[PDB]
């Protein structure tokens, strides 16, 4: 597999478990720090980063009834400039730019306790596909599916239903939606970290997935595996392979990577493009830091960049 070695430029530093890089509708940049702890208990944070200086501001340090969050993944909404945050203790949060937030679900659409979440992806229809590798949300004792198969997948729909759509993953992690050229969502990709697999499903409709398949194979036998993922504008899927020192690049058909990107650190965790550029922001857990590098082409547009009242 061909490997490329682009220049990585430092963006910011000292962010425990740096994760969830995201741009909002105004171009501001945010990161989550899931692994910040106070007195050994979760006290994770959502940060805004000034791209010009690298300075960090904590906008939200979410807690519900004294249970601190482990915010781990983020996407920006389209119709309002607000962040949807996957939290390993609190489930799914919606966080405003002013730092206020709401916890969306204690239970799912069937009344089962919600599980703690790690990453999420909006499709262009506005449905939010979410990985849930933790066990039950606070106040339940914290557990996660690194060793046993109890991780789940949800779809939080436009009509506000939190629907469990699959179960029994060993640490479902990154997630992404593939769209037809006309914008129709049609494939969901889910990383399963320790098994070194990417799984696919056909998206038949909102919260309707079928044809579960082992879509992609992640190199290496290190502890870790696929963490976050992002599509480029040609539907290549770039996947942080935590523990391998590389980001893998899969072509549209999956299988084995067609290219790797060597990083100057062992533990890439997540990645996100700056809108309308080739610049990918990458979080990593060797140094607990954020970097950027130039890819070969622009990113796939996220839902927040599309227009509700568009014509074309
Ligand atoms: Ca993750």
UniProtKB/Swiss-Prot annotation:
User: What is this protein's pH dependence?
Assistant: Optimum pH is 8.0.
Known outcome of mutating residue 35 to Q: 50% decrease in activity
Q: What is the effect of changing residue 285 to A?
A: 90% decrease in activity
User: So what does mutating residue 227 to N actually do?
Assistant: 100% decrease in activity. Loss of calcium 1 binding. 100% decrease in activity
Q: Name one GO molecular function term.
A: calcium ion binding
Documented effect of changing residue 75 to W:
No effect on activity
Reactions this protein catalyses: diisopropyl fluorophosphate + H2O = diisopropyl phosphate + fluoride + 2 H(+)
Q: Which residues form the active site?
A: 285
Q: Anything known on activity regulation? A: Inhibited by chelating agents.
**Changing residue 193 to A does what?**
60% decrease in activity
Query: What does changing residue 144 to S do?
Result: 45% decrease in activity
Gene3D superfamilies per UniProt: TolB, C-terminal domain
Q: What class of enzyme is it?
A: hydrolase
In terms of temperature, how does the activity behave?
Optimum temperature is 35 degrees Celsius.
The observed outcome of changing residue 269 to A is: 30% increase in activity. 19% decrease in activity
Q: What happens on changing residue 171 to W? A: 19% decrease in activity
Q: Which cofactor does it need?
A: Ca(2+)
What outcome follows a substitution of residue 19 to Q? Answer: 100% decrease in activity. Loss of calcium 1 binding
**Per UniProt, where does Ca(2+) 1 bind?**
19, 118, 173, 227
User: What use does biotechnology make of this protein?
Assistant: Has potential application in bio-remediation by detoxification of organo-phosphates used in insecticides or nerve agents used in chemical warfare such as soman, tabun and sarin.
Q: What is the effect of changing residue 179 to N?
A: 20% decrease in activity
Give the consequence of mutating residue 246 to N: 4% increase in activity
Bound cofactor: record note = Binds 2 calcium ions per subunit.
- Kindly state the subunit structure of this protein: Monomer.
**Function of this protein?**
Biological function and substrate unknown. However, it is capable of acting on phosphorus anhydride bonds (such as phosphorus-halide and phosphorus-cyanide) in organophosphorus compounds (including nerve gases).
Name of the molecule in the record: Diisopropyl-fluorophosphatase
Q: Which organism is it from?
A: Loligo vulgaris (Common European squid)
């Amino acid at each position: 597999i061909p490997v490329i070695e682009p220049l990585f430029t430092k963006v910011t530093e000292d962010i425990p478990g740096a994760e969830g890089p995201v741009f909002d509708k105004n171009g501001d940049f945010y990161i989550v720090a899931p692994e910040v702890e106070v007195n050994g208990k979760p006290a994770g944070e959502i940060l805004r980063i000034d791209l010009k200086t690298g300075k960090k501001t904590v906008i939200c340090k979410p807690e519900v009834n004294g249970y601190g969050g482990i915010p781990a993944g983020c996407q920006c909404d389209r119709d309002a400039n607000q962040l949807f945050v996957a939290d390993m203790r609190l489930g799914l949060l919606v966080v405003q730019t002013d730092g206020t937030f709401e916890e969306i679900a204690k239970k799912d659409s069937e009344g089962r306790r919600m599980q703690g979440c790690n990453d999420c992806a909006f499709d262009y229809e506005g449905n939010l596909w979410i990985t849930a590798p933790a066990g039950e949300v606070a106040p339940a004792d914290y557990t996660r599916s690194m060793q046993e198969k109890f991780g789940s997948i949800y779809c939080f729909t436009t009509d506000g239903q939190m629907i469990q759509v699959d179960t029994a993953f060993q640490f479902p992690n990154g997630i992404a939606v593939r769209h037809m050229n006309d914008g129709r969502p049609y494939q969901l990709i889910v990383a399963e970290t320790p098994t070194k697999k990417l799984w696919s499903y056909d998206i038949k409709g909102p919260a309707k997935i079928e044809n579960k398949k082992v879509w992609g194979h992640i190199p290496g036998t290190h502890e870790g595996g696929a963490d976050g993922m992002s599509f480029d504008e040609d539907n290549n899927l770039l996947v942080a392979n935590w523990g391998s020192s590389h980001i893998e690049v899969f072509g549209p058909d999956g299988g084995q990577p067609k290219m790797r990107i060597r990083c100057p650190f062992e533990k890439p965790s997540n990645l996100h493009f700056k809108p309308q550029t080739k610049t990918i922001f990458v979080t990593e857990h060797e140094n607990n830091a954020v970097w950027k590098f130039e890819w070969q082409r622009n990113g796939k547009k996220q839902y927040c960049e599309t227009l509700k009242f568009g014509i074309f």
